């Protein structure tokens, strides 16, 4: 009785800039799927139940697009045929430049979330960050998206 | 040349299709081969704005007075609250649709 | 059936009274499966090891008392007359802000595995409680599952 | 029958300064091992599989340490006899203080990560923080390292 | 139902161990609470039914702190300022951090 | 005190050692009693830099133009990519012995 | 590149001879019939990999006047590593490791 | 013919890659006499003892951010006899810090020399830990050489 | 025709604290002697002629007057050491702040058979030994 | 015979005239062997590659030094920089610092090398052991 | 002690040889031929005067990290000259703060 | 068992021993079988303070006015200059440097 689990890793394709969700690697390096699928950025549930889902995104930059006004949103969202809108699950807000000055412009910060949610067969979870320009991809170890059934 | 699907007002249940529930209502029991979808109203504090097949309603947002905010529109079973500025406050950041934080006038 | 719970930040969520944060247990994302709840606490029914977690969303329109925030998970047990700290974080956002009057946001997450006996309780505390920014249950929450 | 789990806590000897991993307490207080073991800072896997691994480190300081790099990592690493270097698994990059930080105030910042990884028998996981001078040890509740099979 | 000096273990109400002592073996209907002293570096300050002692806090020299009271089996350590340092952030009875006096 | 181990050129499979694959390749199949270790080369965008018993190659790092960087050496089977300043940029942030961000000339 | 020896060998003239184990240096190079003759690194020195070196690497010292002591001693196959002396805490960093410790006040 | 070389600072010297410095080998003051060059390295043809040397000019306006407390300038051997570079001759400097007035120019030159044994096919390179400190000009201020003794 | 040359490296016995010269390693690691000898800190000349001699010493410390770093000749022709090549440097601050500074000297001097060259540093406690690569002493005939 | 020379700072070493430093060629540790000297310059006789070096002792009682080696040749009407260092020397404290350089250069018969220091006032002459200038063929 | 050559020639062994124009180096020295052959300086080098040099002089680089750019580029007859980048002012030109 | 050696006032030449020269003089020519050590005075700017077998004299030290120093004792063929403070000047750091009031 295999327990569903997955870990997907930041990829060179990861940031579409389309306003769609982030995409993720599923097969290479540290990424894998066990009893879950993937579709267009989404972990797709096969087996219904309660899943701990989690994501980390590594942020950083040389200054911010908006100065001390800049705000980041990092979230996990459910897509389901039962509703025609995406539903927020777990969301964080950060003020990434809040401590920066003009002579201290370069910054790095990670955002992590996790939580247990109920998912039916055929439902999907995706990760979204606004603004994607602050995501600093490296090699799949700094940004990632996963789940396992509990 | 498309493929068949649930109608807009239906949702999947196995390989079948069941009718969606109305706004402000959630599914209590799925439809069966004789039986219709059984819907029940969203308890207070929650809403669902559209036809749905959800088992649970959506939590209404609170408008944070410490953020200089107040409800433009209270929550109801069919609609989320909308937040805007309190009297004596101006919006300092929009979040697209709505306002996120307001400051006083001194 | 493996116990699990996810509790969401609530209208009530802040008593203000030196008591812990309060949470919603049934509406929306919130649920209890084989755990119970009482006055802010997840209450354990089946003894074992649990991963407990909490996220709280902090923020403010600028910065007015204490610059240091503590966000913690704590155990209440009839085995000891004080709450025991389990997993705790400290944060300083206002202390180091370049502008005192800017809107700011910061999210605090923690989790870990702890051992819990039947009848033992876990609560969440934040000081100062007024830095917690409630919305709709997606940004501040409290959960657990047995591992 | 017994699902492997562990939780290891910061302790007086956690910060060796040797370029090696953090060490941890494994028995006293909140620390335990159940079906995992410990060796020089590592959780040692005995039963192969997929594990959620996590670590928290409490950072902070009075002012900012001299000569601190611009970027600091907090990460989980795999040691395996399949490779003579450690493999990065899950890493956060942060800039917790610098030049512009006031010499005179106390700052605090906590770093959490988690994720699921595949581990064979005999493989190990360790935690590293690039500059240990930022770690603020207390009593085992602010810095820690754990895992459980999923 | 347990009185003050007892605590619940399964179906039973068991006597608590004294400060400085931990429950090595819970009481059964037939055998008593077995209390053992906390090992070094840990403590329990009250009558208790804990299987594990509380870990004592370390006073961090890099924060300008030392132990003004050492950890013992019944009492957590308390921290105050190191010599040549003064308090800049205060908690309850102790400091959370001290800075050094400047010199010429 | 250590346990007995395989040679610097071998790696454990169960209770025995097997030979390690060369840099640039990963293990496709382990020794048997009478099978050599079958190695397979690293796929694009991955690398392994040493003799190894790894089932999966290591992911190559990306050099971010938004940080003023480009690869001064491209990922190869045996070697990770390495980053340098983009043309018209100079290094302004260091990570250990190497550059982590570059700034454009004014 | 140029034609090279295998990983467990090193060049002697225009040929290749087998490398010595970690902890050992080359005492005598290989001939056609005769293998590489190796000998253990003297105390205070190390060699951490298969090697074709004629001289061992010197181990680093950990300077107590910088508030340091060896947390791991020099051995034949491994360099010493430095950590804080008792009653000292790290105040200076060199990359991932401590370069100086200060005594408690 | 006694082997000798002097290589000089050039616009490609500072790669920021964590590799060694690169050098000009033919133009101006640079030359190679019975030694070769490859990716920053002086490559030895005739085995023996060589005096090797390097100068790097450091300087700046202010101090680069996040500068380490210990900066090294050194000469290192690459040999097929060992899979890592071996340190030959290295200096530690602390050229500037967060206190350094960001309103003025500082300069400091680092020089080292020594005799080492090199076999045929061995290589010597120069590294500086933090290349942002290095102030290239025209080949007169930073350089790398060797001659057999 | 074998040209005398030597390179001697910092060692754990290098700093005697006795007022005498620094001592050095002569055989292990990167150290060697070729047509020169060694005795109690000194390179001892067998073949008379002009030598380029050199020393590097790595100095440093945490917080903290003048440092002196010198090469000196001992000769039976004079009851005292002759200063040959010498440098003075200022030390050093936060007393939490490390400083480092390397001192290099080189030059050509005439040496007869049986004459000796040594290295001295004052104050010896500011020398930061590591692994033989930071502080060293050598020569070759030119 | 392999050419070589070591020249020592001396009482005349700093002219204060905008010309190069001068040096002693015969007394104490100074000597010339197959090289000549002329107004501060080492003068080459036998053409080829030379390691040239100079040390200058800098210092002061309270308060950009350039220290350089330069080529004079009838092949060009200006001095050519060979090897040059910059140092930030320096309120009210005593300080010392030594500048050393060396390197291999090609010199033709008749060509000259000199040493300059700006500002010359910062050079602290003592007895020829602390500031010097030399070369030898390699 | 006299120069080997009159002002406009330079010594090459026993002989006195004609010089080469700015921007050119001596490719083939006088010897069997009474005359000199000159060839252009390669890119990145210059020679600014009448000369008997076998190698051109390396042009200086202007350091952006010091707030400098070339106000005059390097050419065969002239070295680059450095001045401030846009928005900077000379502090020493050898360095430029904003 | 002690070993043979030049006398105190002699110095080694080859396998043999020659007499040293007086302070203020250097060996111009080594002693021979029939001939004495030939010595010659040290030129101005140099000294030698003891009997010696040196081919060169030691260079006298200069006293740097710019460091607030004057010669208290001038240099001579047999002793080195010694420096102290100039008038209107007192020692900070023999004094290596002095201040004007
Ligand atoms: C929401 O409810 C409260 C009290 O029930 C009322 O006073 C308020 O005006 C309502 N707000 C709006 C915008 O309808
Ligand atoms: C705490 O205990 C230590 C350990 O021996 C002792 O040296 C120290 O003086 C004690 N401090 C106090 C305040 O009692
Ligand atoms: C690396 O790859 C690209 C093609 O993808 C090529 O244009 C570029 O020049 C290569 N870079 C290097 C440094 O070889
Ligand atoms: C390293 O060596 C010393 C000297 O023998 C020894 O006493 C000490 O125990 C060693 N240190 C460690 C941590 O083993
Ligand atoms: C030393 O000699 C100088 C120069 O001739 C002379 O003027 C001075 O008076 C003398 N001073 C002493 C102290 O001998
Ligand atoms: Cl990544
Ligand atoms: Cl609901
Ligand atoms: Cl919320
Ligand atoms: Cl802790
Ligand atoms: Cl307990
Ligand atoms: Cl315990
Ligand atoms: Cl693997
Ligand atoms: Cl070797
Ligand atoms: Cl050795
Ligand atoms: Cl240069
Ligand atoms: Cl050393
Ligand atoms: Cl001098
Ligand atoms: Cl020429
Ligand atoms: Cl002599």
Tab-separated table of C-alpha atoms in Angstrom, chain A residues 2-145:
chain	number	residue	atom	x	y	z
A	2	UNK	CA	2.300	2.770	-1.310
A	3	UNK	CA	1.871	6.135	0.363
A	4	UNK	CA	1.636	8.900	-2.226
A	5	UNK	CA	4.584	11.400	-2.128
A	6	UNK	CA	6.413	13.787	-4.422
A	7	UNK	CA	9.169	16.346	-4.466
A	8	UNK	CA	9.628	18.593	-7.465
A	9	UNK	CA	12.544	20.960	-7.991
A	10	UNK	CA	13.136	24.359	-9.436
A	11	UNK	CA	14.012	24.183	-13.096
A	12	UNK	CA	15.189	26.329	-15.991
A	13	UNK	CA	11.631	26.162	-17.354
A	14	UNK	CA	10.343	27.097	-13.899
A	15	UNK	CA	9.234	30.668	-14.447
A	16	UNK	CA	6.885	31.082	-17.412
A	17	UNK	CA	6.188	34.840	-16.836
A	18	UNK	CA	2.766	33.953	-18.308
A	19	UNK	CA	0.790	34.562	-15.075
A	20	UNK	CA	0.347	30.740	-14.959
A	21	UNK	CA	1.858	28.826	-12.068
A	22	UNK	CA	5.473	27.872	-11.650
A	23	UNK	CA	6.636	24.743	-13.399
A	24	UNK	CA	8.873	22.175	-11.882
A	25	UNK	CA	11.166	19.325	-12.732
A	26	UNK	CA	9.792	15.824	-12.050
A	27	UNK	CA	12.391	13.262	-13.001
A	28	UNK	CA	15.950	14.456	-12.814
A	29	UNK	CA	18.160	15.029	-9.813
A	30	UNK	CA	16.221	15.008	-6.535
A	31	UNK	CA	12.787	15.210	-8.122
A	32	UNK	CA	10.411	12.288	-8.047
A	33	UNK	CA	6.751	11.253	-8.114
A	34	UNK	CA	5.288	8.306	-6.243
A	35	UNK	CA	1.557	7.806	-6.723
A	36	UNK	CA	1.074	11.408	-7.782
A	37	UNK	CA	1.220	12.951	-11.251
A	38	UNK	CA	2.182	16.222	-12.668
A	39	UNK	CA	0.499	18.522	-15.075
A	40	UNK	CA	1.492	21.965	-16.285
A	41	UNK	CA	3.017	22.931	-12.932
A	42	UNK	CA	0.519	20.936	-10.896
A	43	UNK	CA	0.735	17.982	-8.643
A	44	UNK	CA	-2.264	15.874	-9.640
A	45	UNK	CA	-3.838	13.667	-7.011
A	46	UNK	CA	-4.742	10.038	-7.892
A	47	UNK	CA	-5.689	8.857	-4.424
A	48	UNK	CA	-8.047	10.917	-2.419
A	49	UNK	CA	-7.232	12.138	1.057
A	50	UNK	CA	-5.276	14.436	3.365
A	51	UNK	CA	-1.866	15.583	2.158
A	52	UNK	CA	0.837	17.629	3.781
A	53	UNK	CA	1.845	19.954	1.011
A	54	UNK	CA	4.873	22.260	1.094
A	55	UNK	CA	6.912	24.603	-0.946
A	56	UNK	CA	10.015	26.626	-0.604
A	57	UNK	CA	10.957	29.443	-2.911
A	58	UNK	CA	14.274	31.170	-2.847
A	59	UNK	CA	14.050	34.850	-3.354
A	60	UNK	CA	16.591	37.486	-3.907
A	61	UNK	CA	17.743	40.349	-6.021
A	62	UNK	CA	19.857	43.454	-6.675
A	63	UNK	CA	17.375	45.985	-5.252
A	64	UNK	CA	13.618	45.566	-5.804
A	65	UNK	CA	11.368	46.690	-8.667
A	66	UNK	CA	9.338	48.880	-6.228
A	67	UNK	CA	11.757	49.913	-3.439
A	68	UNK	CA	10.420	49.604	0.092
A	69	UNK	CA	6.913	49.271	-1.540
A	70	UNK	CA	7.836	45.795	-2.948
A	71	UNK	CA	5.710	42.899	-1.590
A	72	UNK	CA	5.965	39.254	-2.421
A	73	UNK	CA	3.183	36.687	-2.262
A	74	UNK	CA	4.046	32.980	-2.221
A	75	UNK	CA	1.253	30.502	-2.120
A	76	UNK	CA	-0.172	27.091	-2.752
A	77	UNK	CA	-3.509	26.919	-4.560
A	78	UNK	CA	-5.976	24.196	-5.440
A	79	UNK	CA	-7.435	23.698	-8.886
A	80	UNK	CA	-10.549	21.593	-8.928
A	81	UNK	CA	-13.348	20.879	-11.387
A	82	UNK	CA	-15.736	21.587	-8.534
A	83	UNK	CA	-15.193	25.298	-8.738
A	84	UNK	CA	-14.335	27.424	-11.609
A	85	UNK	CA	-11.761	29.413	-9.620
A	86	UNK	CA	-8.467	28.461	-8.066
A	87	UNK	CA	-8.692	28.298	-4.339
A	88	UNK	CA	-6.085	29.624	-1.935
A	89	UNK	CA	-4.761	27.037	0.516
A	90	UNK	CA	-1.547	28.350	2.186
A	91	UNK	CA	-0.212	31.792	1.535
A	92	UNK	CA	2.601	34.035	2.777
A	93	UNK	CA	3.430	37.658	2.322
A	94	UNK	CA	6.923	39.121	2.718
A	95	UNK	CA	8.513	42.543	2.405
A	96	UNK	CA	11.774	41.582	0.848
A	97	UNK	CA	13.449	45.003	0.539
A	98	UNK	CA	12.178	46.229	3.947
A	99	UNK	CA	15.698	46.374	5.442
A	100	UNK	CA	17.542	47.434	2.317
A	101	UNK	CA	19.174	50.800	1.533
A	102	UNK	CA	20.645	52.123	-1.752
A	103	UNK	CA	24.159	51.286	-0.603
A	104	UNK	CA	22.901	47.782	0.659
A	105	UNK	CA	20.728	46.765	-2.317
A	106	UNK	CA	21.576	43.039	-2.744
A	107	UNK	CA	19.399	40.661	-0.696
A	108	UNK	CA	18.430	36.995	-0.322
A	109	UNK	CA	15.545	35.379	1.466
A	110	UNK	CA	13.722	32.046	1.461
A	111	UNK	CA	9.986	31.524	1.930
A	112	UNK	CA	8.719	28.212	3.207
A	113	UNK	CA	5.223	26.964	3.763
A	114	UNK	CA	3.526	23.705	4.534
A	115	UNK	CA	0.148	22.478	5.738
A	116	UNK	CA	-2.308	19.614	5.573
A	117	UNK	CA	-5.167	19.827	3.106
A	118	UNK	CA	-7.868	17.561	1.706
A	119	UNK	CA	-7.586	16.574	-1.930
A	120	UNK	CA	-9.989	14.520	-4.042
A	121	UNK	CA	-8.934	12.397	-6.985
A	122	UNK	CA	-8.377	14.632	-10.060
A	123	UNK	CA	-7.691	17.786	-7.992
A	124	UNK	CA	-4.480	19.711	-8.514
A	125	UNK	CA	-2.146	21.873	-6.401
A	126	UNK	CA	0.130	24.545	-7.860
A	127	UNK	CA	2.569	27.111	-6.557
A	128	UNK	CA	2.435	30.824	-7.449
A	129	UNK	CA	4.733	33.619	-6.565
A	130	UNK	CA	4.170	37.291	-7.321
A	131	UNK	CA	6.531	38.816	-8.484
A	132	UNK	CA	8.372	35.962	-10.264
A	133	UNK	CA	11.274	38.198	-11.068
A	134	UNK	CA	12.383	37.860	-7.455
A	135	UNK	CA	12.771	34.085	-7.750
A	136	UNK	CA	16.389	33.045	-7.943
A	137	UNK	CA	16.708	29.596	-9.563
A	138	UNK	CA	19.868	27.662	-9.077
A	139	UNK	CA	19.984	23.864	-9.348
A	140	UNK	CA	16.767	22.553	-7.841
A	141	UNK	CA	17.862	22.652	-4.216
A	142	UNK	CA	16.584	26.159	-3.402
A	143	UNK	CA	13.075	26.157	-4.723
A	144	UNK	CA	10.830	23.178	-4.588
A	145	UNK	CA	7.276	21.856	-4.243
